[PDB]
Paper text:
With our study, we demonstrated that the protein phosphatase SiaA and its kinase counterpart SiaB target the protein SiaC at threonine 68 (T68) and provide evidence that the SiaABC proteins make use of a partner switch mechanism to balance cellular aggregation in response to carbon availability. As such, that study is complementary to our data and strongly supports a model that the SiaABC partner switch integrates environmental information, such as carbon availability and surfactant stress, to control biofilm formation through the modulation the activity of SiaD through the phosphorylation status of SiaC.
To gain insights about SiaC, its crystal structure was determined in this study. Native crystals of SiaC were grown in C6 condition of the JCSG+ kit from Molecular Dimensions (0.1 M Phosphate/citrate, pH 4.2, 40% (v/v) PEG 300), with space group I222 and diffracted to a maximum resolution of 1.7 Å. Clear electron density maps allowed complete tracing except for residues 101–103, which are located in the flexible loop between the α3 helix and β5 strands. Notably, SiaC contains a putative phosphorylation site at threonine residue 68 (T68) and as such could represent the target of the predicted protein phosphatase/kinase activities of SiaA and SiaB. A hydrophobic pocket next to T68 is formed by residues L61 and L63 projecting from β4, W95 from β5, I71 and M74 from α2, L107 and F111 from α3 while L66 belongs to the β4-β5 loop. The hydrophobic pocket next to the phosphorylation site of SiaC is of particular interest, as it seems to be involved in the stability of the SiaA/SiaCP interaction. In addition to SiaA inhibition, SiaC also represents an exciting target for interference, as it is structurally most similar to bacterial anti-sigma factor antagonists with little homology with human proteins.
Residue numbers in the entry: 24 to 123, 127 to 147
The structure:
Amino acid sequence: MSDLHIPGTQSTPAIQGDWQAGRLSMQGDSYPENSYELFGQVIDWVERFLADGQRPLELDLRLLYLNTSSIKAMMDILDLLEEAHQGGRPVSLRWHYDRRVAELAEEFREDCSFPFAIQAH
Protein backbone atom coordinates (compact mmCIF):
# COMPACT_ATOMS: atom_id res chain seq x y z
CA MET A 1 0.00 0.00 0.00
CA SER A 2 2.99 2.29 0.52
CA ASP A 3 4.39 4.64 -2.07
CA LEU A 4 7.85 4.16 -3.51
CA HIS A 5 10.06 7.19 -2.98
CA ILE A 6 13.72 7.11 -4.05
CA PRO A 7 15.46 10.52 -3.80
CA GLY A 8 17.48 11.48 -6.84
CA THR A 9 21.26 11.85 -6.73
CA GLN A 10 23.98 12.86 -9.14
CA SER A 11 24.14 9.30 -10.52
CA THR A 12 20.70 7.86 -9.71
CA PRO A 13 17.21 8.98 -10.75
CA ALA A 14 14.48 10.26 -8.52
CA ILE A 15 11.71 7.62 -8.51
CA GLN A 16 8.15 8.04 -7.22
CA GLY A 17 5.69 5.18 -7.09
CA ASP A 18 2.23 6.64 -6.37
CA TRP A 19 0.23 3.60 -5.25
CA GLN A 20 -3.17 5.24 -5.21
CA ALA A 21 -2.78 7.11 -8.47
CA GLY A 22 -1.21 4.03 -10.05
CA ARG A 23 1.69 6.11 -11.36
CA LEU A 24 5.38 5.29 -11.52
CA SER A 25 7.55 8.33 -12.31
CA MET A 26 11.31 8.68 -12.82
CA GLN A 27 13.50 11.72 -13.48
CA GLY A 28 17.23 12.17 -14.09
CA ASP A 29 20.22 10.09 -15.05
CA SER A 30 20.94 6.56 -14.01
CA TYR A 31 24.58 5.48 -13.97
CA PRO A 32 24.81 3.74 -10.59
CA GLU A 33 27.52 1.24 -9.79
CA ASN A 34 24.91 -1.31 -8.66
CA SER A 35 21.72 -0.94 -10.70
CA TYR A 36 19.91 -3.92 -9.21
CA GLU A 37 20.46 -2.44 -5.74
CA LEU A 38 18.60 0.64 -6.97
CA PHE A 39 15.96 -0.91 -9.27
CA GLY A 40 15.27 -4.23 -7.56
CA GLN A 41 12.87 -2.50 -5.18
CA VAL A 42 11.21 -0.77 -8.17
CA ILE A 43 10.64 -4.06 -9.95
CA ASP A 44 9.27 -5.41 -6.67
CA TRP A 45 6.90 -2.46 -6.25
CA VAL A 46 5.56 -2.92 -9.78
CA GLU A 47 5.12 -6.66 -9.18
CA ARG A 48 3.16 -5.99 -5.98
CA PHE A 49 1.04 -3.29 -7.61
CA LEU A 50 0.05 -5.71 -10.38
CA ALA A 51 -0.66 -8.55 -7.95
CA ASP A 52 -2.70 -6.68 -5.34
CA GLY A 53 -5.32 -5.27 -7.70
CA GLN A 54 -6.62 -4.56 -11.19
CA ARG A 55 -6.15 -0.79 -11.45
CA PRO A 56 -4.23 0.77 -14.36
CA LEU A 57 -0.52 1.53 -14.07
CA GLU A 58 1.02 4.53 -15.85
CA LEU A 59 4.75 5.19 -16.26
CA ASP A 60 5.94 8.80 -16.65
CA LEU A 61 9.64 8.90 -17.52
CA ARG A 62 11.99 11.89 -17.69
CA LEU A 63 15.18 9.87 -17.87
CA LEU A 64 18.36 11.25 -19.39
CA TYR A 65 21.52 9.14 -19.51
CA LEU A 66 21.13 5.43 -18.72
CA ASN A 67 24.14 3.19 -18.32
CA THR A 68 24.14 -0.43 -19.50
CA SER A 69 22.85 -1.96 -16.28
CA SER A 70 20.09 0.68 -16.04
CA ILE A 71 18.95 -0.16 -19.58
CA LYS A 72 18.67 -3.80 -18.49
CA ALA A 73 16.73 -2.85 -15.35
CA MET A 74 14.24 -0.77 -17.35
CA MET A 75 13.80 -3.58 -19.88
CA ASP A 76 12.93 -5.83 -16.92
CA ILE A 77 10.27 -3.35 -15.77
CA LEU A 78 8.92 -3.01 -19.31
CA ASP A 79 8.83 -6.80 -19.68
CA LEU A 80 6.79 -7.00 -16.46
CA LEU A 81 4.37 -4.41 -17.84
CA GLU A 82 4.16 -6.19 -21.20
CA GLU A 83 3.35 -9.55 -19.59
CA ALA A 84 0.66 -7.82 -17.54
CA HIS A 85 -0.70 -6.00 -20.59
CA GLN A 86 -1.02 -9.24 -22.56
CA GLY A 87 -3.16 -10.43 -19.64
CA GLY A 88 -5.54 -7.50 -20.09
CA ARG A 89 -4.07 -5.06 -17.56
CA PRO A 90 -4.35 -1.40 -18.66
CA VAL A 91 -0.76 -0.13 -18.87
CA SER A 92 0.59 3.01 -20.52
CA LEU A 93 3.87 4.88 -20.71
CA ARG A 94 5.05 8.40 -21.49
CA TRP A 95 8.73 8.97 -22.32
CA HIS A 96 9.60 12.68 -22.20
CA TYR A 97 12.73 14.04 -23.82
CA ASP A 98 14.25 17.32 -24.92
CA ARG A 99 15.06 17.55 -28.62
CA ARG A 100 17.93 19.88 -27.67
CA VAL A 101 16.10 11.45 -31.87
CA ALA A 102 15.09 9.48 -28.75
CA GLU A 103 16.68 6.34 -30.14
CA LEU A 104 16.71 4.25 -26.96
CA ALA A 105 13.05 5.11 -26.31
CA GLU A 106 12.14 3.97 -29.83
CA GLU A 107 13.93 0.66 -29.32
CA PHE A 108 12.07 0.12 -26.03
CA ARG A 109 8.82 1.12 -27.76
CA GLU A 110 9.29 -1.62 -30.36
CA ASP A 111 9.31 -4.18 -27.53
CA CYS A 112 6.03 -2.94 -25.99
CA SER A 113 2.44 -3.54 -27.08
CA PHE A 114 0.81 -1.03 -24.72
CA PRO A 115 0.52 2.71 -25.45
CA PHE A 116 4.04 4.14 -25.35
CA ALA A 117 4.21 7.85 -26.13
CA ILE A 118 7.62 9.35 -26.94
CA GLN A 119 7.07 13.04 -26.43
CA ALA A 120 9.40 15.93 -27.18
CA HIS A 121 9.08 19.08 -25.09
